[PDB]
């Protein structure tokens, strides 16, 4: 439509071919994924555990806290250790030990290494063998596994079950002391365990790699990256520096050099609009952002307190009530509430200014039930998380509400229903603004339907948040997850609050609905020829094959190409500010709209790409170089785009009050200096150390606590707190700035 | 000096930084090589060679071709195997036939695979230990190892002596028949390799590295990359990425737009000077030019046809006078003779117009002395190759006129001293016509200054190929072969056609001393910083240790960072062809040099980088993506640089000559496709076809004629030709060209 049926072409072309390269490899992910066995037996024909138990171990698993308290293939915590890759370090040192005993008298550390060489050519031939019966149900394990698998199961039985002799590694792990009230729960999810760590050791039907991938970098069983990993590696960061070097050619030649230079206007024209009630409340919205904020800052430090303490905390213990997995989980989903309460609030303070400059009807009440429908589902969550980790709730109703044990969808089911259907009633409510804006006969939806789409797109793909129950299989709860924390959060929300700022920066009279509309469809397909099939770089080691890690590295050093390219849109931003004199109430923003770009290089771009080819992402996956990319990406761009909207929405509802420099720099350069500080001087090297450990020895141990107790690594995480004082003084100093500002 | 005192002591600075990082590692590379053992002997104590047989068989190495023929250490040609790791694989496996037979009774093959792993762990205990005798002079190894190194000196003893049964096995190594006429330097040669297949074997004191960092990739004695290998590999990674960023961050934002907007003048300034005889003796040097880049294209063609046909050609065979490493002997060297020559020439060119417009005394008489000694070089060198590869030359007078056989300095040390003293003969024509030029109490020495020690880089740095003798040790000669390789052709070639082409667009007016130095000294200090220490990128894996392999992996991470961005330089310097009407002229040299820029990114940048990090190299270093980054970078860079040098001084001596389009079309549009055609259809996927090898089964196998004959990698270098004719119809049309320009 209009003079861009360039750009909108080849933005729909874009979408169309992603999403067909991510619906044929969801096929494949669906009918690829490893079998979970119908009847496992040993060789005798004795019956063991079969998938109904597998699975209710499954739902015990979710029951504990899930990917908080440790991981499962990679996706999880760090301090407790990944349990398919200890479970399987363990079942593969008791068959080390029961094949030693009947040939040689000893344990496997007393050989010589001719005779440990010929024990491990014996491992590789059971262990990445032996898999289903080709659709028959049954496993038929070795007796020597099988006794292996009922040696390494009393570990786990008394790991969870509060047993003094296991004490001293539940403080390293930061569990809580007992963990598990149930006996028939713990026995059911080592069967659980074992399956994780079955899937991730045994080869496909023909080809040399397991389920996994070859994923957990094991020397006894050879878990090695196979050679197309390497292969689309090394083919991925081609792509990346013929992306960004093309890129830059075709900027440099290919560009239309106009140079208008359109003139800002004299007055602010938001203030020109008045102050409706569907404005005035937003400040419930911007209390909201910050006191959940506030509250992350300070359970993210207190989950980095079980890391460098135990579980005691200076005193008697909460650990009983508040263990570290429930304040890990509180840590992750306020975080991601805070995140999207302010692009919720920032849509619904451009809602009524769409359409003119007024409320359409019943608007203010619609905002209360939202407002209200949204603390509504944080307590409830919060509640329900309490009720799930401590198991005071029953394993029948602990999905729906409860903990699902996944990290960043860990809300209940009813709860996560509730902030869909909250999602839907904001997209109810933004449509009600643009849709009257748009239903008038003219010419002015050239913009406007590019932000229609992405409030659609970031309204309606939480839904993919469904699609997996509660006992199905774990692959599929990795595919259609990162559905909706790839795509929707990393996906959607840049591709909302970038064509909102630039609807904003539009309206302001700084650019002129040519740089405000050609900037802003080549800034939103850059970015979806790498975001939407690059949701496969978290799904390369978890029950997928060779074709999606070859999708997920190409289509995913493509999109660190337009982020290590921000010194425009972030110069080009920045002196939007030099353009007019009403522009220093709005200095602020326009500050952490320039950190939010720095943060998109820093935090995305060259730790994103640090971690992401599948050779790299194959010793790092589970490892703390994960939560550097974490906290550098999703608080440097959407945890300062979130207080960058914060801070203008202050403006414009609160228009007497300045923004008093002298604390807003404290705000400012405490949060980027902490958060430059604790990822640089303590996360990254903590990383680095993990990284050599792990392709030195093995994946399990880089996570077990003979390594994590290092004495250089207590050090070095105890090192947190020089960057975690200066960040939670940003911190502070942010909320005291915001409550300020609303009273 | 001037109002430059910031950017002169940023690049003093840089100089002093790099050149002690490079003289303090030196040192390291002298003193932490491989010991070549004074007596090896067996176990029992029999007398077998020593180091003087040892250096012997390295000369005799020398004179048969040395690096043309295969790989030592990953240096070499690639058609022939990589000596020191097939000598290491045969010496290998007879160790484990010798170990099988008198504990089993069969070869290894025949074993099942816990007998084989027990076999393999016996390996890693005699070949990773039994160094030197800690300055005791002697080695000392076992008798099966005895057994082994002379069971496989028979084969490279019936490799090298037109043996029937080796018959076929030459034809797919492209050797010569022949290839040596005397007994006793097989005998000593292949002393010499078990020495290079033995110092990449055995452990350091201390360590679990080899001498030459783990280099061969042998499953069998457990060689892979190493600890610090893999993570100054991903810190080089991470560099790379940070350093692309923060300098795009550092452009955009500490940039200075003042938009002086310089006027162009209405006449060609370098037309009103007048055509000095200083001038028109350049004449020659363009003809040498173009005929010695014809040769090198034909002699490229020639050394192709060995890789797809055998040794025949067509009918009777020519192996016997020109082999293939004569003929890659000559395709390199007069590779490196015309680029050298184009910009020697482009240097008389510029040197009597920066004295005013005219010659100093004695200047045309110094031109013509020039020209015929670097043309009696080249001859005096073919002839010495030939002589000494086809063995009509003594050995005791072998290095000094004849062979080297290192790669890049192949030419004898006699024609190796004239090449130097014509370089300093060049010197002093540069320097007689600059140093009158800033001899006057002026104020004029702004750019001048860079120019002269550009220059006198270029002309002084040579004699860095000298520091090593005949039969000194192979690590000095792979420390100080690649300081006038990597720092001088690929170091001070860009630091003196990038300054004085910054002079020559000064000069004209386009650009106005502003551009012309600020953006020179910017332009040579970021190179200077990744390309002086980047030189232990080449000696990675020979005979160093781990922190040179820490240096050259960061400091070759930031001279891939100023290449990746060339939108700018590349559109700045095409923005100037529609400065001036007279422009038009330039064209094609304007047109090359936006080429320069291309080939800049893709060649040096991204496929610079491909084989750069220390994980990567390892399974790279000797393969056929070496060729890749060779042909996009010597000649698309270097080779597009002397051929805009080429055709800029074709006008102001042949200025009544258009250079008629149609035909330069041809010239520009057949060299660049055929060289991204030759490289993306027959080299890329043949090198990553040897990657996926290489990393699969071992560095042996990607060299192996096994492997080489696949019957996908025949018809994939039989499709060299595709790309083949298309260069040769561009490198045609090129010299056609000036041959017609010429006269
Ligand atoms: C500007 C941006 C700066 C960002 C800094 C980034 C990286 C710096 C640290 C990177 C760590 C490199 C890996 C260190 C490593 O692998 O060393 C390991 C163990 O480390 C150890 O046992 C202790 C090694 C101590 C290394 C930690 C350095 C901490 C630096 C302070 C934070 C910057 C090898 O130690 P070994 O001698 O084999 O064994 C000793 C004990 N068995
Ligand atoms: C495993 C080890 C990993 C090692 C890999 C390399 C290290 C990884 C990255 C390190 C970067 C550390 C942070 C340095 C970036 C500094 C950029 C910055 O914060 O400056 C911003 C932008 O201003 C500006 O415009 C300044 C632009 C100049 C940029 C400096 C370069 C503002 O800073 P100000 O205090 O206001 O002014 C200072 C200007 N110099
Ligand atoms: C412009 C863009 C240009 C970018 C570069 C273009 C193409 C790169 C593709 C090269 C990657 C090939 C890797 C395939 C591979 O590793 O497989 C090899 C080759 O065998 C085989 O038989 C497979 C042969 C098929 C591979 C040929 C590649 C096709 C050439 C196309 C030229 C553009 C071995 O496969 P396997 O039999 O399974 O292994 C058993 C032997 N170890
Ligand atoms: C002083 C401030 C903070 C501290 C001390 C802190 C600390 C932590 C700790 C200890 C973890 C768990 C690491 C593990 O699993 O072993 C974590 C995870 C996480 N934090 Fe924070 N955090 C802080 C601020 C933030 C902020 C502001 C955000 C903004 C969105 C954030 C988002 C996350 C996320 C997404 C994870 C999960 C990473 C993963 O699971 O891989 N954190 N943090
Ligand atoms: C721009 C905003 C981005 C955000 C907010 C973000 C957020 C995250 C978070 C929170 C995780 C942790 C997942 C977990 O805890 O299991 C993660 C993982 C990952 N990210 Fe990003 N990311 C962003 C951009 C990128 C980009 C551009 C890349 C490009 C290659 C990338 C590569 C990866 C990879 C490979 C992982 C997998 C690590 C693992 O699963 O252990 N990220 N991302
Ligand atoms: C039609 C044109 C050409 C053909 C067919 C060709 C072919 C070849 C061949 C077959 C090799 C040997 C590969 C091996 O060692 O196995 C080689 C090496 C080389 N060529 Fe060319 N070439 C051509 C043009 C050029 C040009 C124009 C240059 C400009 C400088 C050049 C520079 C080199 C260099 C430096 C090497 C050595 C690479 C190394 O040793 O790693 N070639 N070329
Ligand atoms: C700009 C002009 C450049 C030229 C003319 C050039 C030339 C060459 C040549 C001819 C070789 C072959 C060496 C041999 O035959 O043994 C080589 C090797 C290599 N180049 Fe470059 N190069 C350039 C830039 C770069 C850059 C910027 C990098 C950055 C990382 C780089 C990385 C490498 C590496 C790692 C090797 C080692 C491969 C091996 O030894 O087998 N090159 N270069
Ligand atoms: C960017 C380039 C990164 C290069 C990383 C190479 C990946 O890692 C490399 O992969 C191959 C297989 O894929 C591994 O496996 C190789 O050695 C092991 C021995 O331990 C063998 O069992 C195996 O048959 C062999 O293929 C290597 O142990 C490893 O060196
Ligand atoms: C960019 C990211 C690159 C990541 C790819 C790393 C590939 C490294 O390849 C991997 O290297 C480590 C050593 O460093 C080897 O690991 C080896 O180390 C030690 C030797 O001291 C031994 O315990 C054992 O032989 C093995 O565990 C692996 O066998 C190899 O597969
Ligand atoms: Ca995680
Ligand atoms: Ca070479
Ligand atoms: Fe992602
Ligand atoms: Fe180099």
Same mark, same amino acid.
């Given at each position: 439509?209009?003079?861009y049926?360039?750009?909108?072409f080849?933005?729909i072309?874009v *979408?169309?071919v992603t999403?067909?390269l991510l619906?044929?490899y969801?096929?494949?992910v669906?009918?690829?994924?490893?079998?979970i066995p119908e009847?496992?037996?040993?060789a005798?024909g004795?019956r !063991?555990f079969?998938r109904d138990?597998? *699975?209710?171990?499954q739902?015990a698993?979710q029951?504990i806290? %899930?990917?908080?308290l440790?991981?499962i293939?990679?996706?999880?915590?760090?301090?407790?250790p990944?349990?398919?890759?200890?479970?399987?370090?363990?079942?593969?040192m008791?068959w080390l030990?029961l094949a030693?005993?009947?040939?040689?008298?000893?344990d496997?550390?007393?050989?010589?290494?001719?005779?440990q060489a010929a024990?491990?050519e014996?491992?590789?031939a059971?262990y990445?063998?032996?898999?289903?019966?080709?659709?028959?149900?049954k496993?038929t394990?070795?007796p020597?596994?099988?006794?292996?698998?009922a040696?390494?199961?009393?570990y786990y039985?008394?790991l969870?079950?509060d047993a003094?002799?296991?004490?001293?590694?539940?403080?390293?792990?930061?569990?809580?002391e007992n963990?598990?009230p149930?006996?028939?729960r713990?026995?059911?999810?080592?069967?659980?365990?074992?399956?994780?760590?079955?899937?991730?050791?045994?080869?496909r039907?023909?080809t040399? #790699? +397991?389920?996994?991938?070859n994923?957990?970098?094991e020397?006894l069983?050879g878990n090695?990256?196979s050679?197309?990993?390497v292969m689309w590696?090394i083919?991925?960061?081609?792509?990346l520096?013929?992306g960004?070097?093309?890129?830059?050619?075709?900027?440099?030649?290919l560009?239309?050099?106009?140079?208008?230079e359109?003139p800002?206007?004299?007055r602010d024209?938001?203030?020109?609009?008045?102050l409706?009630?569907?404005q005035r409340?937003?400040?419930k919205?911007?209390?909201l952002?910050?006191?959940?904020?506030?509250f992350?800052?300070?359970?993210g430090?207190?989950?980095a307190?079980?890391?460098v303490?135990?579980?005691?905390?200076y005193?008697?213990?909460?650990?009983?009530?508040?263990?570290?997995?429930?304040?890990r989980?509180?840590?992750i989903?306020?975080?991601?509430?805070?995140?999207?309460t302010?692009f919720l609030?920032a849509?619904?303070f451009l809602?009524?200014?769409?359409?003119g400059?007024?409320?359409?009807?019943?608007?203010?009440?619609?905002?209360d039930?939202l407002?209200?429908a949204?603390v509504?589902?944080?307590?409830?969550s919060f509640?329900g998380? =309490?009720?799930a980790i401590?198991?005071?709730?029953p394993?029948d109703?602990?999905?729906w509400?409860g903990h699902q044990?996944y990290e =960043?969808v860990d809300?209940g089911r009813?709860?996560?229903?509730g902030?869909?259907?909250?999602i839907?009633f904001?997209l109810?409510?933004?449509?009600?603004?643009?849709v009257?804006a748009?239903?008038?006969?003219?010419?002015?939806?050239?913009?406007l339907?590019?932000?229609?789409?992405?409030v659609?797109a970031?309204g309606?793909?939480?839904?993919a948040?469904?699609?997996?129950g509660?006992?199905?299989?774990l +692959?599929?709860?990795?595919?259609?997850?990162?559905?909706?924390?790839?795509?929707?959060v990393?996906?959607?929300?840049?591709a909302?609050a970038?064509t909102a700022?630039a609807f904003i920066?539009?309206?302001?009279?700084?650019?002129?609905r040519r740089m405000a509309? +050609?900037?802003?469809?080549?800034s939103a397909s850059?970015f979806?020829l %790498?975001?939407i099939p690059?949701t496969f770089?978290?799904?390369?080691?978890?029950?997928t094959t060779?074709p999606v890690?070859?999708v %997920?590295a190409s289509?995913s050093?493509l999109?660190? #190409?337009p982020?290590?390219?921000?010194?425009?849109?972030?110069?080009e931003?920045w002196?939007?500010?030099?353009?007019?004199?009403?522009?220093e109430?709005?200095?602020?923003?326009l500050?952490?709209?320039?950190?939010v770009?720095?943060?998109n290089?820093?935090?995305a771009?060259?730790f994103?790409?640090?971690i992401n080819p599948?050779?790299?992402?194959? =010793?790092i996956?589970?490892?703390?170089?994960?939560?550097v990319?974490?906290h550098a990406?999703l608080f440097?761009?959407y945890?300062?785009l979130a207080?960058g909207?914060t801070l203008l929405?202050?403006?414009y509802?609160?228009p007497?009050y300045? !923004?008093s420099?002298g604390?807003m720099? !404290?705000?400012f350069?405490?949060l980027?200096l %902490?958060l430059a500080?604790?990822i640089?001087?303590s996360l990254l090297?903590?990383?680095?150390?993990?990284?050599?450990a792990s392709?030195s020895?093995?994946?399990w =141990?880089?996570?077990?606590?003979?390594?994590?107790?290092q004495?250089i690594?207590?050090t070095?995480?105890?090192?947190?707190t020089?960057?975690? #004082?200066?960040?939670?003084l940003?911190?502070?100093?942010?909320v005291?700035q915001?409550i300020?500002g609303?009273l």
């Amino acid at each position: 439509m209009g003079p861009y049926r360039r750009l909108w072409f080849t933005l729909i072309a874009v *979408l169309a071919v992603t999403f067909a390269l991510l619906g044929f490899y969801g096929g494949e992910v669906y009918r690829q994924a490893p079998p979970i066995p119908e009847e496992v037996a040993s060789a005798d024909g004795t019956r !063991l555990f079969g998938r109904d138990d597998i *699975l209710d171990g499954q739902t015990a698993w979710q029951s504990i806290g %899930g990917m908080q308290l440790g991981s499962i293939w990679g996706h999880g915590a760090y301090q407790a250790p990944d349990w398919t890759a200890d479970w399987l370090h363990r079942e593969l040192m008791a068959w080390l030990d029961l094949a030693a005993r009947d040939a040689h008298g000893r344990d496997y550390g007393q050989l010589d290494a001719p005779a440990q060489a010929a024990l491990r050519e014996q491992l590789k031939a059971e262990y990445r063998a032996n898999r289903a019966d080709a659709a028959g149900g049954k496993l038929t394990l070795s007796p020597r596994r099988a006794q292996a698998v009922a040696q390494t199961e009393a570990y786990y039985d008394q790991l969870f079950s509060d047993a003094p002799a296991l004490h001293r590694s539940r403080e390293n792990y930061a569990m809580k002391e007992n963990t598990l009230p149930d006996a028939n729960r713990r026995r059911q999810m080592t069967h659980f365990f074992f399956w994780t760590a079955w899937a991730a050791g045994t080869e496909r039907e023909g080809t040399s #790699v +397991t389920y996994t991938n070859n994923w957990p970098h094991e020397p006894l069983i050879g878990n090695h990256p196979s050679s197309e990993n390497v292969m689309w590696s090394i083919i991925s960061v081609v792509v990346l520096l013929a992306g960004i070097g093309l890129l830059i050619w075709a900027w440099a030649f290919l560009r239309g050099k106009e140079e208008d230079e359109p003139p800002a206007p004299a007055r602010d024209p938001l203030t020109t609009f008045a102050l409706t009630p569907s404005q005035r409340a937003l400040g419930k919205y911007l209390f909201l952002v910050v006191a959940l904020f506030g509250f992350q800052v300070l359970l993210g430090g207190f989950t980095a307190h079980y890391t460098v303490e135990g579980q005691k905390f200076y005193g008697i213990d909460l650990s009983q009530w508040f263990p570290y997995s429930l304040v890990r989980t509180w840590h992750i989903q306020s975080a991601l509430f805070w995140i999207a309460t302010g692009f919720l609030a920032a849509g619904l303070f451009l809602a009524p200014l769409i359409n003119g400059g007024r409320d359409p009807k019943y608007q203010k009440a619609g905002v209360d039930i939202l407002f209200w429908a949204l603390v509504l589902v944080v307590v409830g969550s919060f509640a329900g998380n =309490y009720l799930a980790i401590a198991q005071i709730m029953p394993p029948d109703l602990n999905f729906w509400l409860g903990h699902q044990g996944y990290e =960043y969808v860990d809300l209940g089911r009813l709860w996560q229903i509730g902030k869909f259907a909250g999602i839907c009633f904001w997209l109810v409510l933004m449509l009600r603004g643009i849709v009257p804006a748009l239903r008038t006969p003219g010419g002015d939806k050239n913009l406007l339907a590019l932000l229609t789409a992405s409030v659609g797109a970031i309204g309606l793909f939480y839904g993919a948040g469904f699609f997996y129950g509660e006992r199905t299989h774990l +692959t599929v709860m990795e595919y259609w997850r990162w559905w909706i924390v790839h795509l929707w959060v990393e996906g959607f929300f840049e591709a909302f609050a970038t064509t909102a700022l630039a609807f904003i920066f539009s309206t302001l009279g700084l650019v002129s609905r040519r740089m405000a509309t +050609t900037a802003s469809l080549a800034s939103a397909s850059l970015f979806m020829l %790498g975001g939407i099939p690059g949701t496969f770089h978290h799904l390369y080691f978890a029950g997928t094959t060779t074709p999606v890690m070859a999708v %997920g590295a190409s289509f995913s050093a493509l999109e660190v #190409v337009p982020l290590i390219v921000l010194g425009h849109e972030a110069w080009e931003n920045w002196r939007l500010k030099t353009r007019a004199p009403w522009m220093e109430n709005l200095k602020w923003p326009l500050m952490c709209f320039v950190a939010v770009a720095f943060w998109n290089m820093l935090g995305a771009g060259v730790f994103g790409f640090m971690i992401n080819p599948p050779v790299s992402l194959y =010793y790092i996956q589970g490892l703390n170089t994960t939560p550097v990319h974490a906290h550098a990406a999703l608080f440097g761009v959407y945890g300062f785009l979130a207080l960058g909207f914060t801070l203008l929405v202050l403006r414009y509802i609160r228009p007497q009050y300045a !923004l008093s420099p002298g604390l807003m720099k !404290l705000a400012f350069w405490g949060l980027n200096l %902490g958060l430059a500080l604790m990822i640089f001087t303590s996360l990254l090297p903590i990383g680095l150390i993990q990284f050599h450990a792990s392709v030195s020895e093995g994946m399990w =141990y880089a996570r077990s606590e003979a390594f994590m107790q290092q004495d250089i690594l207590k050090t070095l995480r105890w090192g947190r707190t020089f960057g975690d #004082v200066v960040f939670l003084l940003g911190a502070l100093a942010m909320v005291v700035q915001v409550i300020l500002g609303l009273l």
